[PDB]
């Protein structure tokens, strides 16, 4: 059920969520009882309904629990920022840099600027000028700044 499996599949996330290492294989590890296209229909919608997330690492694709703070955050973010923003926080520590976001998003530097500045007013990302040469202004989450110097 959309709301039931929404809240109980959010319950395995809010309890543990198999940490960050959680992949879709761990779904069948806990609840595999659901049919494939159904549990995936509600996975797809809860990611659309921003009650779950997906992280890109290693084998398969990771999932995690997400609350309305960052959920209404990203749904409030534009369609431009949509994949952009959540892709930025993937670094979370070392940040990421201008042109290396351009190729990954397949946009210009024309547009990726204005959504960045939008995120600057948003203050969910902060300008960071790191050890390597100050041509960069790498961008990590406005909240977190673990870094090498």
């Amino acid at each position: 059920q959309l709301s039931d499996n929404a809240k109980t599949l959010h319950s395995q996330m809010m309890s543990k969520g198999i940490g960050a290492l959680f992949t879709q294989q761990e779904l069948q590890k806990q609840m595999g009882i659901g049919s494939l296209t159904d549990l995936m229909s509600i996975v797809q919608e809860l990611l659309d309904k921003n009650l779950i997330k997906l992280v890109k690492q290693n084998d398969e694709l990771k999932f995690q629990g997400v609350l309305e703070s960052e959920a209404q955050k990203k749904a409030t973010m534009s369609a431009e920022e949509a994949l952009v923003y959540s892709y930025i926080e993937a670094s979370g520590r070392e940040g990421i840099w201008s042109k290396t976001i351009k190729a990954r998003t397949n946009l210009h530097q024309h547009v990726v600027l204005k959504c960045l500045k939008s995120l600057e007013s948003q203050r969910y990302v902060k300008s960071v000028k790191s050890v390597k040469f100050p041509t960069r202004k790498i961008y990590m989450l406005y909240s977190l700044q673990p870094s090498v110097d």
């Binding site: 946009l107 210009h108 024309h110 547009v111």
Partner: protein, 50 residues
């Protein structure tokens, strides 16, 4: 034979077949240009005439 089809068709007829046919085909190859921004825009070539 030579009265109907002139002595030089070679430069004539190929140039005619150009200005009539290929010009219509060249834009028929690229009739759409949209740069990447403002997903609602497009410029569609349709006709060529001289």
């Amino acid at each position: 034979f030579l009265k109907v089809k002139g002595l030089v068709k070679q430069h004539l007829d190929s140039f005619n077949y150009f200005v009539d046919t290929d010009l219509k085909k060249i834009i028929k190859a690229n009739q759409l240009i949209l740069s990447d921004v403002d997903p609602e825009f497009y410029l569609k070539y349709v006709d060529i005439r001289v």
